[PDB]
Write a protein that binds this DNA or RNA. Structure first.
Ligand SMILES: [Mg+2]
Ligand SMILES: [Mg+2]
Ligand SMILES: [Mg+2]
Ligand SMILES: [Mg+2]
Ligand SMILES: [Mg+2]
Ligand SMILES: [Mg+2]
Ligand SMILES: [Mg+2]
Ligand SMILES: [Mg+2]
Ligand SMILES: [Mg+2]
Ligand SMILES: [Zn+2]
Lengths: 132, 287, 148, 108, 152, 275, 166
RNA sequence: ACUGAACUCCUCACACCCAAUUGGACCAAUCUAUCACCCUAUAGAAGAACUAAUGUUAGUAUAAGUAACAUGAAAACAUUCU
């Protein structure tokens, strides 16, 4: 629902542009369904800022649309299994534990393919340059 | 009934299309690299078994879509509407290339197919028409040919100039309709199922299946007209601009059956000829 | 002017007089203020006349809001869906009575120019004139100067 | 003579939206089969011409360095040679202009 | 009325026209390739051809020497005209120059032309090439040619 | 800035009116708008129609099955009008058949059936219910009320009237609110037919009469783009009906329609319905 | 001033149902305060109205007017933002649905005349607006045929009533 | 003979077609008193109402994209030439 007022308190400012920038001017239909394995803490470290790495293996649904309401990412009905390593940060007096950064391992499987095709231009050539 | 034959062939064709698209689910992203001289190195992240060289041209620009008529996919000519199957290198072939031999062959093949559709839908119901084959004739020959066996009732009838002009008028009606050239690489079993009534097409499908290491047979459809081709075709009938069914010649061995060869000539929009040059080409194609 | 105004043809709602007469006014809504001289006449109308009008017009549901927005008003809703809003600001009791009776008597059709003072669905009983009425026929239907 | 009346926007639109005043659509624009650039049929491809002009400017800078001064036009022919090229038997007795780049594909 | 008038009106008058063409021609002889407004190039092309003819007339020809002296404002080009350009075209009889239209000048949108002396050492201009003989129309015409040759 | 408030407020009111005209709010059922009392409205419904309904029957008539289903679904987080609508539909069809057969004894059963279908169709009943305010009192799950639901509720109201006051009063109601819907209507505007000439030939065979001879009675400008033809159908040299047209075929077809109207007694100048 | 054209890109439609035709993408772009007469810009805008993006770019690349280059830059920017931000699959699958020029904020200068008199020169500025719609350019309106003309005339003839009578 | 007015009649309703001038009935907006407290009322006031002064100021038109204006040539942008 683009509840940015609550999102500011829910996630860290380091994470907020990632949360709300690319999702601007498009409706997302993210929904949650029962998790697969219980969440557990992984490790914690430390003017002073807290940090907690938590591993989750849940099941989620995504459906990202356009300005015009046409689907461009993910089926809305079929759920997917998500493995995430979410790192929380806390302020150390009134702050709480907010999503700071999601760690994506290099061995993580590739994400869902996108509906539309894409063209990737080659290196542009100046008049004095030749393609090699 | 000819209408029943067309309906059943279309139903089988659509059944095969649905079966193949279902067999290819999801969206697998293949990588196709433009290997042509212009816009070199551009990579299209296309959808496997859905995206086409037409889609790649659309990504490039509108000039590519308008002028590009064949696709060398990894060096092999590909119909512009033939869904791509794997990551590969693509090059678009136009009529005005340095050596447009493959494009010329494809244009001749597609013009012959259009002629075949016109012949099938021209004659009256009483007379029966069997399109035996479209012989692969060189462009230098001056005409594209389609061989057909007509009803024995017409074993002496020869089309008049008005009949030929009516044939050309029907061909121009197809051109105005601007029907895309749908393609399918099907199994010989399904091809024989589609063309079971036509013995000539049955044996031609058998020849093509034998030639190919597998039982893959190319089936082409303009609209409601399915036929077996010897290679890739042009995208749309609207590519043809000047089109004329020039003449009909009965082949020498008339004793088994009367194989009448419909000879015509055509030129695309990109290569329009002046009126006088076109008339001379018509005269040459009437032979 | 007529040219700068919409027009319609004379009509009823559902052939309102053929079988039976149905009063087309179905709802009256008086928004009246407790205080405020603008609705003094409306208050007196509610005190002295709205009950008699209601019992004279059993087919009209009358609402009295006693808390208006802007000026005191009477909103008349008709069967055909028309809504006519009339301000009863600074109107006397008799003025409001006449206005309400006019709303009760009229139909919901737009008060715009009416093209014709009459409306027939059967303008002709003997057959509408055409050029061949009153024209005699000729033997074998021969047109003038026809040889045969 | 001064105008007798203000001209209305209706009259003015009828005048200045006439087809005689509208910009005509050009139908001689095509694509250079060489490089795929837009060109008019009778006019040189702008991008190809810019390429040729830049190379000519470099060659002429080298020519100026070789000549070293005004009024020094050689009375002998000139040949441009790129890296990895040697004067031919025909190129003998012709002043050599050496270019530091490699031979362009469009140059021959 | 200008029926049959073959010369443009350029510069500030007749002398100015001649001087403008002379400067363009001197530039053409020096650089062997010149950009200039299309009309001025078209006017100067005839003088370029006539200069090559005068150079062919010979170094020792007094009339040719006087013509070259007038028409080349930089005198180091006269030996060039007589010992490079004319020998380059001794075999030819005409068409020593190549004139092509160029995209309009960005300054004033002027119609522009490039004029060069054929056979220069500069990179070749992107000449217009006819359609390949292997195109569909050309192949059909080749078939016509072969049939006509065989029949008649 | 100019001191004052009244002009600014007037401008705000005009802006609000223009905004309502440009982007009118989605239609909302009258029940959800202010000044609504369902009991008073349903009483005034009967008093308007000058009929003594029984309030329970009318309330049941106005409530649909879909409304009950939606109400139960909402309650998760009443007697429908089905039988009343069935009774009303059956009685209305039979009484309309009686009316039409008494008025036009020469009309065939197919014609009477088509007329009754027109008079009880979704379009006619929808129009009548909308202008009788049935839609306002209708309890449905979606708004605006679809014509099928509106027709069902209207016939439920007719059935409620039947149970409350009787067949005679219900017949008067049907005469007043459905029979009047054919006033000004043309026979074949209500009963769509194909091949009126063939249908006329069938009727003449039923009457043991030979097929009529189509014959050109009058014509004008035959060779122009605006011809007028009058074609008359003759039964044994006797004119039964003539009709105009642009082409001879159209004129003949229209003459067939005129002959059918005359045979069925549904001519334009027939005796008007008695009320 | 008004800046509604910029805001027209920020409207988000509700997601479409599966049984609903795909809504074509619409991209609004503008250049404000172009040193050019809006009357001169109008001809270029009118020229490229209704054409595909590639056809418009080709036409503008060979037009001598100063505004042609500006409109070409605006169209290229609109194409780029159409691909990047408005989820347009193909660059070339766009046509100019709207192209207009508007008056900009202009500056007044003095033009000296010959007898101590003067005029007020206006340093004219113009805006330029485009809407690009995804898809092939809509076909041009076919010319009226004789059959269509005759049909319209006969409809008018049939529409006649007997006026000012019962 | 008919046609033929704002004359006259007919159905209904009525203060509702002269300049200057004069009598009268109303009245927009504003402020104030007191209300209303919703956008009005009763009064008291007054910088109290603009299709017109070659009116003043500002905006933008029309004439008009018109009149008019401007940069000698090539080039290696070094330079050379006229
Ligand atoms: Mg001059
Ligand atoms: Mg009179
Ligand atoms: Mg009088
Ligand atoms: Mg004043
Ligand atoms: Mg004013
Ligand atoms: Mg004034
Ligand atoms: Mg202007
Ligand atoms: Mg003028
Ligand atoms: Mg001038
Ligand atoms: Zn090029």
């Amino acid at each position: 629902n683009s509840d940015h007022d609550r999102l500011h308190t829910l996630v860290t400012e380091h994470c907020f542009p990632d949360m709300t920038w690319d999702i601007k001017y498009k409706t997302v239909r993210w929904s949650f369904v029962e998790s697969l394995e219980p969440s557990h803490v992984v490790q914690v470290r430390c003017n002073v800022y807290g940090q907690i790495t938590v591993r989750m293996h849940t099941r989620q649904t995504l459906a990202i649309y356009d300005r015009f309401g046409r689907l461009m990412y993910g089926q809305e009905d079929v759920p997917k299994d998500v493995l995430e390593y979410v790192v929380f940060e806390k302020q150390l007096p009134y702050g709480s534990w907010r999503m700071h950064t999601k760690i994506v391992p290099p061995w993580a499987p590739p994400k869902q393919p996108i509906l539309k095709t894409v063209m990737i231009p080659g290196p542009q050539l100046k008049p004095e340059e030749e393609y090699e | 009934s000819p209408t029943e034959l067309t309906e059943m062939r279309n139903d089988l064709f659509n059944k095969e299309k649905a079966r193949q698209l279902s067999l290819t689910p999801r969206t697998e992203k293949i990588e196709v690299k433009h290997v042509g001289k212009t816009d070199p190195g551009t990579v299209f992240v296309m959808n496997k078994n859905i995206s086409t060289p037409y889609s790649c041209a659309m990504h490039l620009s509108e000039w590519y879509c308008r002028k590009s008529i064949l696709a060398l996919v990894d060096g092999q000519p590909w119909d512009m509407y033939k869904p791509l199957t794997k990551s590969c290198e693509i090059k678009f072939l136009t009529f005005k290339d340095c050596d447009p031999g493959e494009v010329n062959k494809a244009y001749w093949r597609s013009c012959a197919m259009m002629m075949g559709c016109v012949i099938e839908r021209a004659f009256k119901d009483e007379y029966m028409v069997n399109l035996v084959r479209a012989p692969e004739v060189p462009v230098i020959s001056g005409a594209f040919c389609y061989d057909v066996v007509l009803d024995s009732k017409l074993d002496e009838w020869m089309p008049t100039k008005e009949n030929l002009r009516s044939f050309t008028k029907d061909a121009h009606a197809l051109i105005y309709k601007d029907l895309p050239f749908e393609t399918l690489e099907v199994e010989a079993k399904v091809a024989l199922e589609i063309f079971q009534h036509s013995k000539y097409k049955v044996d031609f499908i058998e020849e093509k299946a034998s030639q190919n290491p597998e039982r893959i047979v190319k089936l082409h459809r303009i609209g409601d007209f399915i036929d077996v081709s010897e290679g890739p075709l042009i995208p749309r009938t609207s590519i043809c601009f000047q089109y004329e069914v020039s003449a009909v010649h009965n082949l020498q061995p008339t004793q088994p059956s009367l194989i009448r060869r419909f000879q015509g000539v055509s030129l695309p929009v990109h290569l329009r000829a002046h009126f006088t040059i076109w008339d001379k080409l018509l005269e040459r194609s009437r032979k | 002017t007529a040219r700068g105004t919409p027009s319609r043809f004379l009509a009823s709602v559902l052939h309102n007089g053929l079988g039976r007469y149905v009063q087309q006014l179905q709802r009256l809504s008086f928004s009246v203020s407790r205080d405020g001289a603008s609705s003094r006449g409306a208050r007196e109308f509610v005190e002295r006349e709205v009950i008699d009008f209601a019992r004279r017009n059993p087919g009209v549901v009358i609402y009295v809001n006693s808390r208006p927005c802007c000026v005191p008003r009477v909103v008349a809703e008709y069967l055909n869906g028309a809504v006519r809003e009339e301000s009863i600001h600074c109107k006397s009791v008799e003025e409001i009575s006449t206005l309400v009776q006019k709303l009760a008597d009229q139909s919901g059709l737009d008060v715009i120019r009416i093209r014709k003072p009459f409306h027939t669905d059967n303008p002709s009983i003997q057959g509408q004139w055409h050029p061949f009425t009153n024209k005699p026929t000729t033997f074998r239907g021969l047109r003038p100067r026809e040889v045969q | 003579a001064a105008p007798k009346n203000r001209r209305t926007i209706e009259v003015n639109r009828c005048r200045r939206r006439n087809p005689q005043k509208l910009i005509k659509v050009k139908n001689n624009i095509d694509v250079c089969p060489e490089c795929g650039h837009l060109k008019q049929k009778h006019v040189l491809c702008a991008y190809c011409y810019e390429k040729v002009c830049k190379e000519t400017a470099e060659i002429r800078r080298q020519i100026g360095k070789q000549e070293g001064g005004p009024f020094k036009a050689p009375t002998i022919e000139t040949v441009v040679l790129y890296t990895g090229e040697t004067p031919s038997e025909q190129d003998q007795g012709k002043r050599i202009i050496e270019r530091d780049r490699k031979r362009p594909s469009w140059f021959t | 009325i200008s029926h049959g008038r073959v010369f443009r009106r350029m510069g500030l008058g007749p002398e100015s026209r001649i001087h403008l063409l002379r400067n363009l021609l001197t530039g053409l002889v020096r650089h062997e390739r010149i950009e200039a407004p299309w009309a001025r190039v078209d006017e100067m092309r005839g003088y370029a051809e006539k200069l090559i003819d005068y150079g062919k007339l010979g170094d020792t020809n007094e009339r040719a020497m006087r013509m070259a002296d007038f028409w080349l404002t930089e005198k180091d080009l006269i030996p060039k005209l007589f010992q490079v350009l004319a020998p380059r075209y001794k075999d030819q009889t005409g068409g020593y120059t190549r004139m092509l239209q160029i995209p309009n000048r960005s300054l004033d949108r002027a119609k522009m032309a490039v004029i060069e002396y054929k056979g220069n050492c500069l990179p070749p201009l992107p000449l217009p090439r006819r359609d390949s003989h292997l195109t569909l129309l050309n192949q059909l015409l080749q078939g016509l040619r072969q049939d006509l040759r065989q029949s008649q | 800035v100019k001191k004052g408030f009244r002009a600014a407020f007037r401008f705000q009111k005009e802006l609000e009116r223009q905004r309502l005209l440009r982007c009118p709010p989605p239609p909302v059922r009258r029940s959800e708008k202010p000044n609504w009392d369902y009991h008073a409205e349903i009483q005034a419904f009967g008093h308007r129609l000058q009929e003594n309904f029984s309030l329970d029957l009318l309330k049941t008539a106005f409530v649909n099955s879909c409304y009950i289903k939606s109400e139960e679904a909402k309650r998760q987080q009443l007697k429908s009008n089905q039988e009343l609508s069935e009774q009303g539909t059956s009685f209305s069809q039979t009484c309309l058949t009686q009316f039409l057969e008494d008025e036009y004894p020469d009309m065939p059963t197919e014609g009477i059936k088509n007329l009754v279908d027109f008079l009880t169709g979704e379009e006619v009943v929808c129009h009548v219910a909308r202008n009788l305010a049935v839609e306002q009192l209708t309890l449905s799950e979606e708004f605006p009320v679809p014509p099928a639901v509106l027709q069902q509720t209207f016939f439920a109201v007719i059935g409620a009237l039947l149970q409350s006051s009787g067949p005679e009063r219900t017949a008067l109601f049907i005469r007043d609110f459905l029979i009047t819907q054919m006033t000004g209507k043309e026979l074949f505007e209500m009963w769509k037919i194909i091949n009126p000439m063939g249908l006329l030939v069938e009727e003449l065979k039923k009457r043991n009469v030979s097929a009529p001879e189509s014959r050109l009675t009058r014509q004008s400008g035959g060779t122009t783009a605006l011809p007028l033809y009058f074609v008359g159908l003759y039964c044994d040299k006797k004119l039964i009906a003539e009709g105009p047209g642009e082409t001879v075929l159209v004129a003949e077809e229209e003459a067939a329609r005129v002959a059918l109207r005359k045979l069925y007694g549904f001519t334009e100048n027939r005796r008007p319905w008695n009320y | 001033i008004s800046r509604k054209w910029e805001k027209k890109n920020k409207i988000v439609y509700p997601p479409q149902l599966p049984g609903e035709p795909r809504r074509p993408a619409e991209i609004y772009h503008c250049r404000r305060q172009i040193k050019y007469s809006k009357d001169k810009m109008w001809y270029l805008a009118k020229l490229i109205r209704g054409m595909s993006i590639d056809q418009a770019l080709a036409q503008l690349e060979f037009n001598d007017k100063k505004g042609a280059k500006i409109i070409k830059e605006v169209l290229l920017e609109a194409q780029d933002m159409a691909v990047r931000d408005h989820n347009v699959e193909f660059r070339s699958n766009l046509y100019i649905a709207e192209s207009t020029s508007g008056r900009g904020q202009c500056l007044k200068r003095i033009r000296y005349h010959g007898r101590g008199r003067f005029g007020i020169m206006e340093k004219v500025y113009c805006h330029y607006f485009v809407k690009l719609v995804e898809g092939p350019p809509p076909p041009p309106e076919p010319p009226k045929t004789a059959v269509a003309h005759a049909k319209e005339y006969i409809q008018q003839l049939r529409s006649r009533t007997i006026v000012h009578t019962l």
